[PDB]
């Protein structure tokens, strides 16, 4: 195998070394949302190859601790006070950066920030700030597969509106659209497991009919690297679905099998009922702070996005265009995390 | 040539070189006894193009290389034995390097070609190896020569050669081109 | 080429910064391969960076014909490559792939073209064939005319004669000292 | 050139008493356990020439010298500058081993070591050093010889003048 | 301008028009002054300090320079020639940078 350059202008001059941690890569990156699940792996991929990553974060020293180890001295720059509404800070963050990755998103609403702020206002303002600079060469935005303007869920609708605004301001931006991402710190399998084990009943919207294409986190991180190593990818949206398409019922059954649950704890909470149980609780969320007790699953938006098939469109770009074979999320290393809990020979 | 004549032990190597070898006959022992001193009695500058060799001939650093002044110590340098392309003599030299930088160039013994002497141009042209260097492929556009990758430059050369045919292609080799 | 001069459409400069201006027809496509930016690079549509004599292991022949070899004292700078590798890569790109793919194979090709190149470090005697050559070129030497020029050196300034020397600051100071 | 007459005596005597068993070229390199790509590197077997600054003959191949002077050196590879502190960074594992520790008394010893490990090598003989003064200044007496300007012409003598 | 100027020495401990011994540090960054290479601020440099100190008159044609007042708490002992020295063109201690001049050679 031959190492492929990062297709950035004048990279050939600055780059030097084998491509490792101590090598010099000509990529300075501002990854918004670095401390998040998706952002941390993107930071790891970029910094692993000797590049410098600027990580703006909302003040939390313990949350951004893993990012410190990611790179050599001076490569991972952690900026202490990040606000989505502060223009001057955004300009300072991307001052030296030639690639910008936006992984900032909220699964749930709060009193301080709504979907329309984070998923629409921040992308537009950041798009303008990046456009005025000119030094930034590559822009990558991470979105859900099911995001559509004509979507019942407010999250997936605001995300699509923000993506359209980004495409308008920066025409050469790439919209990465992965499926449900499986990982050690993911919110897919971890939430499903917590539902199966520490919840009285596991409500399943309809009967699990909705089809999904989960993908492994390492696959999305490698897809990001392949996006940055090709300039021909610019201006295109990639639907990074997994190798296998599965209904939610299959995933629930296979989690029950792997964990060796005594029996099936899932119940049938059909639609038109979650839309009445959670509808007031959304208004409850919008006027109260973040609470661990209730979140994400217990929302009408989650029910609305679990009544549709979040699958890649037939004619679409995907992993094959990036020459990546996605790994199965139901077997191998991907499934080790849930496997460690119980396999019936364990405890 | 930098001078610290206080460090001068009164050997006559520099004077003997300037007379027998260099042949400019500029240096002499002026004085008598302990206050005897070495150098041009008038204010004169050493004119031979073999002037650098007195620095190597000087045992006690009284004559030193002004370009290579206070820049490095001997133990810090890795020496590689190569040849000088300054002219067609092919003088055998030893290039001393610290890291990625050439620090100084000194001759080697080869009775066949250069006994142990090096010309000043060959000795002190390493300075021009740090300046006006080409690092990246450049392809011309309306904005001038601009940064390009190796593939793009080769594509442009291919498109150019496609037009030309036979003796329309012409090659001019330079002074420093090698056999390969 | 000598019988029927053809206006060149593509000119390849292999480190040639001292070309006469009439050599390039001024509408030709110029490829400059070299390691300093000079008169050659300024007149180039494509510039290909190459290593210098301190950065490459290359063969040079003396005025006596002794074959001597350089070593890589310091690594190549930026996105520059060894010159023979550049030409072979370009040969593959343009559709005429060259047989050799390694430095020893290039050295074997040099040995085939001229056997003395295999004897690095040794000068090979020449058979005295000079008289037969001049008997061969009887008509040509008669064709040659007389010029109103006197036998003299072509070296105007000794310190600057090549691109490396022209870049050197020390050589510029030497020239200023001589010219005052 | 006569003899060191010290520990080197027992060193040489231990050398001549003992010997090594012959093995096929390159077999020991597999036993070494190092990455096999190490032996893809090319070897130069040379003796350093004398530094021009100094006139000592110890480093040269001279009868005075009793130390190993033939080095195995590997070709130079890429080096860059640390972005933070400008330090010289490298990825070559064999950068300094050959220069620092691989010292051999004789060229055949280094060639045997390289062939035993499987390294391809090129041996470079040092330029011969002959301590022969030129005929003009062959001795101290030649400095004040008649060679400088010829035999003194005696046509200036008053007898010859008159 | 400084990008194509020949590196030169002011001449306090050297001559007015000599070459300055230079390494290639800072050549890529674009810095061409000695102090600029290692000091990035706008404060007073140590060279500015040493220029401010004035030459000191001594008697004789040679002065012993120990750098500091106590011999064992400074530079090695140095003997500096006072011949051909005046206030405008003083002799310099290489270790310390102190400047000296004497009128003794003029038979005074």
């Amino acid at each position: 195998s031959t190492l492929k350059p990062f297709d950035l202008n004048a990279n050939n001059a600055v780059r030097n070394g084998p491509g490792g941690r101590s090598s010099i890569g000509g990529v300075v990156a501002t990854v918004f949302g670095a401390n998040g699940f998706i952002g941390s792996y993107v930071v790891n991929e970029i910094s692993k190859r000797g590049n410098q990553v600027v990580c703006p974060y909302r003040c939390n020293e313990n949350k951004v601790q893993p990012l410190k180890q990611m790179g050599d001295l001076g490569q991972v720059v952690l900026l202490p006070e990040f606000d989505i509404h502060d223009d001057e800070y955004i300009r300072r963050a991307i001052s030296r950066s030639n690639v910008v990755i936006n992984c900032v998103g909220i699964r749930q609403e709060t009193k301080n920030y709504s979907y329309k702020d984070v998923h629409v206002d921040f992308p537009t303002r950041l798009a303008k700030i990046v456009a005025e600079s000119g030094k930034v060469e590559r822009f990558i935005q991470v979105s859900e597969m099911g995001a559509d303007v004509s979507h019942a869920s407010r999250r997936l609708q605001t995300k699509a509106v923000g993506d359209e605004a980004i495409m308008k301001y920066i025409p050469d931006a790439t919209i990465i659209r992965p499926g449900n991402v499986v990982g050690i710190e993911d919110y897919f399998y971890n939430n499903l497991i917590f539902q199966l084990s520490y919840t009285i009943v596991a409500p399943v919207i309809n009967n699990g009919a909705n089809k999904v294409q989960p993908t492994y986190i390492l696959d999305v991180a490698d897809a990001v690297v392949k996006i940055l190593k090709d300039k021909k990818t610019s201006g295109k949206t990639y639907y990074l679905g997994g190798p296998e398409t599965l209904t939610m019922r299959q995933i629930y059954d296979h989690l029950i099998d792997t964990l060796r649950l005594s029996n099936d704890d899932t119940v049938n909470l059909r639609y038109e009922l979650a839309k009445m149980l959670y509808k007031p609780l959304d208004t409850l969320r919008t006027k109260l702070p973040e609470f661990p007790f209730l979140g994400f699953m217990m929302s009408s938006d989650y029910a609305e996005e679990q009544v549709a098939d979040s699958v890649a469109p037939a004619g679409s770009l995907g992993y094959k265009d990036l020459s990546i074979s996605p790994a199965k999320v139901t077997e191998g290393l991907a499934i080790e995390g849930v496997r460690f809990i119980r396999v019936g020979g364990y405890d | 040539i930098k001078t610290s004549m206080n460090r001068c032990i009164h050997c006559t190597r520099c004077v003997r070189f300037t007379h027998e070898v260099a042949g400019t006959s500029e240096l002499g022992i002026t004085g008598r006894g302990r206050d005897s001193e070495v150098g041009t009695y008038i204010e004169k500058l050493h004119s031979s193009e073999l002037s650098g060799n007195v620095i190597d001939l000087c045992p006690v650093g009284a004559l030193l290389s002004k370009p290579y002044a206070f820049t490095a110590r001997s133990w810090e340098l890795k020496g590689t034995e190569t040849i000088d392309v300054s002219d067609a003599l092919g003088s055998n030299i030893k290039v001393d390097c610290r890291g990625t930088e050439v620090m100084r160039i000194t001759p080697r013994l080869n009775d066949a070609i250069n006994e142990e002497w090096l010309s000043d141009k060959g000795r002190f042209q390493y300075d021009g190896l740090k300046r006006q260097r080409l690092n990246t492929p450049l392809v011309k556009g309306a904005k001038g020569l601009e940064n390009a990758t190796w593939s793009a430059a080769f594509d442009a050369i291919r498109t150019a050669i496609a037009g030309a045919k036979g003796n329309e292609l012409k090659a001019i080799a330079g002074k420093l081109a090698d056999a390969e | 080429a000598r019988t029927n001069p053809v206006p060149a459409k593509v000119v390849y400069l292999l480190g040639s910064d001292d070309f006469k201006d009439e050599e390039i027809p001024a509408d030709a496509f110029v490829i400059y391969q070299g390691h300093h930016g000079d008169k050659g690079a300024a007149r180039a549509n494509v510039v290909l960076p190459g290593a210098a004599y301190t950065e490459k292991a290359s063969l040079f022949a003396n005025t006596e014909g002794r074959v001597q070899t350089t070593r890589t004292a310091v690594p190549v700078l930026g996105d520059a490559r060894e010159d023979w590798k550049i030409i072979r890569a370009l040969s593959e790109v343009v559709g005429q792939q060259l047989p050799y793919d390694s430095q020893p194979q290039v050295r074997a090709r040099l040995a085939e073209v001229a056997p003395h190149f295999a004897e690095i470090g040794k000068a090979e005697s020449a058979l005295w064939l000079n008289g037969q050559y001049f008997k061969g070129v009887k008509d040509l030497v008669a064709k040659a005319a007389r010029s109103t020029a006197s036998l003299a050196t072509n070296i105007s300034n000794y310190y600057m004669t090549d691109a490396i020397s022209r870049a050197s600051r020390t050589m510029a100071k030497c020239t200023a000292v001589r010219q005052q | 050139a006569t003899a060191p007459q010290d520990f080197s005596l027992a060193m040489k005597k231990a050398d001549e008493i003992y010997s090594g068993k012959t093995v096929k070229a390159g077999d020991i390199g597999f036993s070494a356990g190092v990455p096999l790509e190490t032996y893809n590197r090319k070897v130069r077997i040379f003796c350093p020439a004398k530094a021009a600054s100094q006139s000592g003959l110890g480093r040269t191949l001279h009868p005075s010298s009793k130390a190993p002077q033939w080095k195995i050196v590997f070709e130079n590879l890429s080096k860059w500058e640390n972005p933070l502190m400008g330090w010289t960074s490298t990825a070559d594992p064999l950068e300094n081993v050959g220069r620092s520790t691989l010292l051999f008394y004789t060229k055949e010893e280094a060639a045997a070591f390289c062939a035993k490990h499987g390294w391809e090598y090129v041996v470079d003989e040092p330029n011969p050093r002959k301590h022969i003064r030129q005929k003009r200044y062959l001795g101290y007496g030649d400095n004040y010889s008649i060679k400088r300007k010829g035999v003194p012409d005696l046509a200036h003598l008053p007898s010859n003048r008159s | 301008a400084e990008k194509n100027k020949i590196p030169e020495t002011v001449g306090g401990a050297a001559f007015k028009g000599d070459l300055r011994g230079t390494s290639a540090v800072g050549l890529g960054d674009g810095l061409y002054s000695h102090t600029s290479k290692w000091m990035q601020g706008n404060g007073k440099s140590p060279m500015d300090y040493i220029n401010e100190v004035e030459p000191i008159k001594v008697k004789g044609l040679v002065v012993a320079s120990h750098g500091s007042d106590d011999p064992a708490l400074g530079c090695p002992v140095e003997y500096i020639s006072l011949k051909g020295t005046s206030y405008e063109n003083p002799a310099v201690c290489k270790y310390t940078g102190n400047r000296y001049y004497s009128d003794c050679w003029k038979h005074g």
């Binding site: - | 001038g144 | - | 933070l84 502190m85 | 890529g28 960054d29 990035q40």
Partner: peptide
């Protein structure tokens, strides 16, 4: 957050410690 090396991102004039000056092509 007072002292950082001169090659740091925080440094006003960040330093790439390159020891070679690069030729600048002529304009147009």
């Amino acid at each position: 957050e007072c002292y950082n090396p001169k090659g740091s991102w925080f440094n006003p004039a960040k330093r790439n410690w390159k020891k070679v000056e690069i030729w600048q092509p002529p304009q147009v």
